[PDB]
């Protein structure tokens, strides 16, 4: 034992995935008005598995498009972006406390 992997856990890979998800969600919000653009989804479980050791998912629209072809539901995108930011803040707190505890033990302070 006594290794950074065994000490940090999955809180280092989770942060990267949460930032990846925010990039995907922000892309859907920006491309909301572009006709023909299809909303992009991200699988957290698969992304976390790939990050730990190392495809395109589309979001099914709740209602038909008005003709443009864009399936971005901006009501859902804001809700997911808000959730992603909260869980990302927790992951930083979880990962940040891993380093603080490691520093505390190696210095006894």
């Amino acid at each position: 034992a006594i290794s950074f992997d065994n000490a940090l856990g999955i809180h280092q890979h989770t942060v990267g995935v949460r930032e990846r998800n925010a990039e995907v969600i922000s892309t859907n919000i920006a491309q909301a008005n572009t006709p023909g653009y299809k909303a992009r989804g991200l699988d957290f479980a698969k992304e976390l598995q790939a990050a730990t050791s190392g495809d395109k998912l589309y979001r099914l629209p709740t209602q038909p498009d008005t003709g443009d072809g864009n399936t971005v539901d901006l009501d859902l995108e804001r809700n997911l972006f808000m959730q992603n930011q909260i869980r990302h803040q927790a992951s930083l707190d979880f990962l940040g406390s891993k380093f603080k505890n490691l520093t505390k033990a190696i210095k006894g302070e």
């Binding site: 034992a1 006594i2 290794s3 065994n6 000490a7 505890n101 490691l102 505390k104 033990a105 190696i106 006894g108």
Partner: protein, 208 residues
């Protein structure tokens, strides 16, 4: 069940803080220094070898004689732990056992009996006695053993000094101090027999 990485680090730093104690209470450092203390005291030199080199030679001598036990700890405990073959709890026990075996090889049965009755505990095999009781018995045996070796080392220097004093008195010069004349003879006989190499053989090999 196994200790977390944070807790294992805390235990590691704790043993480093107690590292001077483990050298002078569990290893062979106590016997070597006491024997070398007698050798300095036996010759006419009081502080001439100085304390620094004696401890430094003692430290190197201990690393020489503790090399079998330290390597046994390395193989049995460190290697499975580094390769993540075993947990931290069993690795610590796997490291403690060679130290316990070495302390048993340098102790006496009478010393163990005194302290095990002193602790007021129940045991039937010396092999599974707690290390808290083995340590006082180990050093007590070490001090007695070191005095035995030191007494044997003191005799030849006492032999030389008594001969020189008798010779000077027999020649009639009751006015000259034997110490000044005897000191070169003690040093010369310590060198031409290569005394320290002989002491190394009887001290390093005394543990086995």
């Amino acid at each position: 069940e196994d200790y977390s990485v944070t807790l294992q680090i805390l235990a590691l730093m704790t043993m480093l803080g107690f590292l001077p104690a483990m050298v002078i209470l569990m290893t062979s450092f106590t016997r070597i220094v006491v024997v070398m203390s007698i050798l300095r005291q036996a010759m006419g030199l009081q502080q001439t070898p100085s304390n620094q080199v004696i401890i430094g030679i003692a430290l190197f001598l201990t690393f020489f004689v503790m090399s079998p036990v330290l390597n046994e700890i390395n193989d049995k405990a460190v290697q499975p732990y580094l390769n993540e073959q075993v947990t931290a709890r069993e690795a610590f026990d796997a490291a403690q056992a060679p130290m316990k075996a070495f302390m048993l090889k340098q102790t006496r049965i009478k010393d163990l009996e005194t302290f095990v009755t002193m602790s007021g505990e129940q045991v039937d095999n010396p092999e599974d006695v707690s290390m808290a009781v083995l340590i006082p018995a180990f050093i007590t045996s070490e001090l007695k053993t070191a005095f035995q070796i030191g007494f044997m080392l003191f005799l030849p220097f006492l032999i030389i000094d008594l001969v020189v004093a008798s010779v000077l008195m027999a020649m009639g010069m009751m006015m000259l101090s034997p110490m000044i004349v005897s000191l070169p003879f003690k040093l010369m006989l310590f060198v031409l027999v290569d005394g320290w190499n002989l002491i190394l053989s009887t001290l390093a090999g005394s543990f086995a």
